[PDB]
Amino acid sequence: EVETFAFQAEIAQLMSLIINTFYSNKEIFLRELISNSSDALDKIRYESLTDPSKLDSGKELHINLIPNKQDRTLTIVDTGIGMTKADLINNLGTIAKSGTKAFMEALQAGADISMIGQFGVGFYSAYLVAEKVTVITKHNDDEQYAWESSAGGSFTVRTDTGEPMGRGTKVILHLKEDQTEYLEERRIKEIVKKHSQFIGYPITLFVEK
Numbered sequence: 323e324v325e326t327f328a329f330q331a332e333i334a335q336l337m338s339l340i341i342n343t344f345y346s347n348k349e350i351f352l353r354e355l356i357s358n359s360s361d362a363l364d365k366i367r368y369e370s371l372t373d374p375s376k377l378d379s380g381k382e383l384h385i386n387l388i389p390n391k392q393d394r395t396l397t398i399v400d401t402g403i404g405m406t407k408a409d410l411i412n413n414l415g416t417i418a419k420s421g422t423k424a425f426m427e428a429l430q431a432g433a434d435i436s437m438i439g440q441f442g443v444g445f446y447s448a449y450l451v452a453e454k455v456t457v458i459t460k461h462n463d464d465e466q467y468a469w470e471s472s473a474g475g476s477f478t479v480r481t482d483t484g485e486p487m488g489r490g491t492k493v494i495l496h497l498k499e500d501q502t503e504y505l506e507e508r509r510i511k512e513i514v515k516k517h518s519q520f521i522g523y524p525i526t527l528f529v530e531k
């Protein structure tokens with residue numbers, strides 16, 4: 323049972339512009355997704371301060387980076403607050419319509435593309451490097467769901483029958499054929515050190531056989 327949704331026009335426009343604009347500084351996608359994971363971890367930590375049972379679904383607060391050269395995927399896993407089905411449909415818990423408008427207005431006023439995260443829509447920078455993005459998420463108040471989009475104006479949501487995650491979000495980047503540098507250990511390490519060196523949660527870069 324798969325549900326197919328249209329992106330709001332403004333979000334489809336932002337994704338088309340991310341996909342089609344010439345812009346060499348693609349590595350910022352990883353900073354943006356790690357920052358999103360850190361924000362989601364902050365949220366579940368705050369909730370746990372007054373309700374410890376919020377961590378019954380998992381006490382560890384961390385971020386894992388999992389490259390897979392056979393699948394040509396880079397997966398960013400966090401154990402943050404996760405998203406409900408309603409969150410996924412509502413632009414993955416973002417105010418993407420007004421954020422896109424502000425990002426657009428800022429670019430006309432002299433902001434840089436790398437500033438996308440200041441406008442709450444840093445997630446969509448994934449499409450700088452990914453032809454398809456799958457988001458697996460589990461929120462304490464809902465079931466496990468899979469969101470997926472190859473852009474082109476639509477996304478899908480289905481119940482996820484795969485590996486239970488407990489709580490958190492898994493962003494699976496199906497990389498473009500010419501973007502496989504982001505599967506190399508030394509390249510990922512360089513980007514994390516350059517852009518994410520002060521994130522307040524452990525970031526573990528997995529290695530491969």
Ligand SMILES: NC(=O)c1ccc(F)c(Cl)c1
Pocket residue numbers: 339340341343345429435438
């Ligand atoms: N207008 C642009 O060239 C532009 C604006 C925002 C973006 F995220 C990108 Cl990649 C390009």
